[PDB]
Amino acid sequence: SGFRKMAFPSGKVEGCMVQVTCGTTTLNGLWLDDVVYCPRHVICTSEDMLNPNYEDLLIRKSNHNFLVQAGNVQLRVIGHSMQNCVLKLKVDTANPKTPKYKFVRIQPGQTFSVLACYNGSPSGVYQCAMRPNFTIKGSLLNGSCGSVGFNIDYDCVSFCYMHHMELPTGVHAGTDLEGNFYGPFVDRQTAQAAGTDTTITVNVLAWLYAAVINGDRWFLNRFTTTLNDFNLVAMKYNYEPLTQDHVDILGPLSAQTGIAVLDMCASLKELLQNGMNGRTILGSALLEDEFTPFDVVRQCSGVTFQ
Amino acid sequence: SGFRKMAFPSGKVEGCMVQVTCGTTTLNGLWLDDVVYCPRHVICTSEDMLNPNYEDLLIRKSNHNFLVQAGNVQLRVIGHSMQNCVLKLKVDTANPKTPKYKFVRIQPGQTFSVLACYNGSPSGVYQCAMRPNFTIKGSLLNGSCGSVGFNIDYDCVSFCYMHHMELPTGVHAGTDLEGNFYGPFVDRQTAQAAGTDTTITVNVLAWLYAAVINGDRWFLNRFTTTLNDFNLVAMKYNYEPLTQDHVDILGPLSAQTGIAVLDMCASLKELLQNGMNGRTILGSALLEDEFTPFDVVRQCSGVTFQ
Ligand SMILES: *C(=N)[C@H](C[C@@H]1CCNC1=O)NC(=O)[C@@H]1[C@@H]2[C@H](CN1C(=O)[C@@H](NC(=O)C(F)(F)F)C(C)(C)C)C2(C)C
Numbered sequence A, B: 001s002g003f004r005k006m007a008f009p010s011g012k013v014e015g016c017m018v019q020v021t022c023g024t025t026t027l028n029g030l031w032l033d034d035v036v037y038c039p040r041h042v043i044c045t046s047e048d049m050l051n052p053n054y055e056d057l058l059i060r061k062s063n064h065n066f067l068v069q070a071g072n073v074q075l076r077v078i079g080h081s082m083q084n085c086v087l088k089l090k091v092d093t094a095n096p097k098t099p100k101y102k103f104v105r106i107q108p109g110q111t112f113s114v115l116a117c118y119n120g121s122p123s124g125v126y127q128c129a130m131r132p133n134f135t136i137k138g139s140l141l142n143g144s145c146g147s148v149g150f151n152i153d154y155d156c157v158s159f160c161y162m163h164h165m166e167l168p169t170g171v172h173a174g175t176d177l178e179g180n181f182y183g184p185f186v187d188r189q190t191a192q193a194a195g196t197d198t199t200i201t202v203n204v205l206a207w208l209y210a211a212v213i214n215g216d217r218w219f220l221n222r223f224t225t226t227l228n229d230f231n232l233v234a235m236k237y238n239y240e241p242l243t244q245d246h247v248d249i250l251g252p253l254s255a256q257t258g259i260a261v262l263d264m265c266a267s268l269k270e271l272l273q274n275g276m277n278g279r280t281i282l283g284s285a286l287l288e289d290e291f292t293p294f295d296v297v298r299q300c301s302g303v304t305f306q
């Protein structure tokens, strides 16, 4: 029993982290097979970053200009290219700790674990959601660029995020592992801001199913509602719309706990309207929207990884 | 910027996890050097567990009765002993992934990461505090016994917790790595309950310093107070007493943020009395007591591990 914001075990990703230095600038890289991936602004001075021309900056660089350190081993760089906002460095040594892996681009509301690194070394791991405005509520500092976000499926690491920048209000933005930003941001130090954020409704419901699984049931009322009556109320409270795909996805939890997805929607409808009245669900005094249905199932049924 | 409940990177501990089967009963073991440690109730049937005589149960067992599986390798058991509530199994192969490590017993209020495992495989990692009543608010299921809690210091894993049981209200109890329970519990299925829990005051203050570091400052008032005026109020609200050792420990954060420890106590005094008035500190609608001062410093200054 019990419900925590759980991270994926990080060991597979730890074996892939390296430090990448170009001149004065140092950040983290991901070493997979014989390629190191990192954010392209490693090739910028602090001044370049206000208004960089990356293609121009990269012409001036040759392979020996990139210092890649894996522990106390320097990896010899034998090629380099740029793919959108990530730099790819080919090295003459294949990382022997490379796990089976894929590159994926995730959807808003999906979760992943971030392995926060500095100088190629891990500082910690935590669970994050891609927010509907395409930010993540991270804990990331100077030097953390190149830290990656990931899921594990059995023995396979799906890398979905590489960290690039912090935005106003202390939220974070980055790219998929092809260098393509989540959201309309660019890797340049100029005034930018996230769109107004919104609550991931399918995740709140999944969290409510987890509460039921763990014996938190005071918020259950005796009502149903159609998808229309609920989504109408949700729009006003700035809640993302709930689709029938979401209902289908919530299915396994609905069948497990004996509560139809629409009955949970009825219960949540009341909660939003009437407030929690000083009580807590799973020890939180706020509706929680950063657990996907599969996160709840993986947590509550003990799913492991190899 | 940003503040998350962060776990230690788990890779070092992952390399130590194995599965230990005795007859029908299976749970997790920790393989360090040529010894596997696990909870001693692996030698119990379900019926034995209501009222076990462990010494009696263990006489009946020889080395070949313990199936230890490390991945797809069976480790040959060549010795076994019992040390309080943990069983130690000597195997003929030293774990080549054994990190530098120590066994420590932690104090109430101290934090650690739990690597939750089933069948010798990791399911996830999360941060936990030893509660003042000697429980932990875990997320742990059937088969999770043998999962361990730990800290990392540079390159050294300090193992502080081995998981044994769940108590009423869905909280968890276990031993240090010498088999000695935290708190007055015993490894037997009979009615037991945790003492009434209490809020770890030095941790709340450390969390308030983290909020200040990250720009959350609305709860700061213009008052001081002596340690007596505050601790008197705290007793009523069921807050652990704040000692001068705690003040000395809070020192680095006090000097970093420019707020004397007593001024933070003044601010917290008001918070408890007047409530948060529907606002959130670091995005939480509740005072948070599961970050030690060193957790805040390690998170906010980017401390890594090798
Ligand atoms: C990579 N190591 C850092 C990580 C930052 C640093 C502080 N917290 C983080 O997450 N990435 C950067 O510093 C990027 C980078 C230039 C500047 N930058 C920023 O994150 C800046 N943000 C912005 O300029 C804004 F508003 F656009 F988001 C900063 C003010 C330093 C937070 C480049 C190349 C975008």
Ligand SMILES: *C(=N)[C@H](C[C@@H]1CCNC1=O)NC(=O)[C@@H]1[C@@H]2[C@H](CN1C(=O)[C@@H](NC(=O)C(F)(F)F)C(C)(C)C)C2(C)C
Residues within 6 Å of the ligand: A001, B027, B041, B049, B140, B141, B142, B143, B144, B145, B146, B164, B165, B166, B167, B168, B172, B186, B187, B188, B189, B190, B191, B192
């Ligand atoms: C080890 N794999 C399990 C982990 C438990 C199972 C469900 N959640 C957990 O954390 N450990 C046990 O099942 C231990 C073990 C016998 C029974 N037990 C319990 O945790 C039981 N608790 C108690 O009996 C009580 F009240 F004393 F805490 C149970 C009712 C199954 C939760 C032994 C040998 C103590």
